[PDB]
Design a protein around this ligand. Sequence first.
Ligand SMILES: Nc1ccn([C@H]2C[C@H](O)[C@@H](COP(=O)(O)NP(=O)(O)OP(=O)(O)O)O2)c(=O)n1
Ligand SMILES: [Mg+2]
Ligand SMILES: [Mg+2]
Length: 342
Amino acid sequence: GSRKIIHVDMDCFFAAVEMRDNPALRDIPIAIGGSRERRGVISTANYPARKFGVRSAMPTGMALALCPHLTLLPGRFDAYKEASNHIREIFSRYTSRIEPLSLDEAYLDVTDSVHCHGSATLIAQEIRQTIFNELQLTASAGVAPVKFLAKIASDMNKPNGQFVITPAEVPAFLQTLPLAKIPGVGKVSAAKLEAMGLRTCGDVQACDLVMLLKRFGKFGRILWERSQGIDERDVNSERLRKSVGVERTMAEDIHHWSECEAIIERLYPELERRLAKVKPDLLIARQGVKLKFDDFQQTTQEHVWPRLNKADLIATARKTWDERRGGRGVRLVGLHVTLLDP
DNA sequence: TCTGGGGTCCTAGGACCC
DNA sequence: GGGTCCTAGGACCC
Ligand SMILES: Nc1ccn([C@H]2C[C@H](O)[C@@H](COP(=O)(O)NP(=O)(O)OP(=O)(O)O)O2)c(=O)n1
Ligand SMILES: [Mg+2]
Ligand SMILES: [Mg+2]
């Protein structure tokens, strides 16, 4: 019993919406992120800017060093959110079985759909179309019998394209598929696997599951499965937010508690308004805080607590500030809450 | 050039329970 | 000693 999964992905999502709305931004390098002086990074960039080597999650310092004409934008989340909602409604026209992964992404299970002669390919294509219509933005797609494979597929013919992997193509596909392409294998893991000669799924198929479990625990099992092409992960649609936090990095490190306090004062209303949106009584399971120093180490203090309370956060933030700052500078203050379990 | 902010999931020791 | 809650931290993703 094979399934039909479609990963839809908006390309250069933030950038795209900026360009739709401002056509002057179209053929010149632009990016969303914090400024040089604000210690910020790039959220995303448009394709003119990628040309120069500008990637997401990358320090704006490096970004301008690479592309001095870069246009920096602060970004408008309601605009992106509005787009998101729209594209999710568009998904809803084709299935209910929809698992968003973020603003711009979603898994669809279309197996039991009778829309386009059960053609997942025509479904994805009809979805990329109608998204370009009524939004004037561009989406890419990947079709596969499972989640991860559809995900890797969605970035194969981007921008403005889609890629299908049938079960017959799968084994061939996995052979040369590098482990780092698998979602959940970042830099560190990739580096351990390389260090033991593992680069592609091909390489792990020849490995022993026992040893892989000994070395990576449950992550080994995951690897092994994904390598065999196995991904029994069901598309969900029922998933819910488990937590919420608000954090900030200042332009210069701060050294006095008064300043840390001054930060918390400004962060709390934010955290409150945001939590109210989904929990008007403000009733939480745990709250707590977060500092990160100059030596970038990051500590968090969080405890059980009935309802978002400002002074407690201030208190525990002072404890934290004393009991483990050892004279280091501080670059970010952050508040956090863990929502109740329903 | 020097490292966001919003999240998820996983691990692991002690506490606590049986 | 096996669950499970508590807290801290790390790797990962968008
Ligand atoms: N590290 C990251 C990665 C993505 N993002 C945001 C900005 C992007 O517009 C958005 C979409 O995620 P993404 O698909 O990884 N990025 P983007 O859509 O630009 O990549 P492509 O799909 O265009 O290749 O998430 C971020 O803020 N920080
Ligand atoms: Mg994406
Ligand atoms: Mg995208």
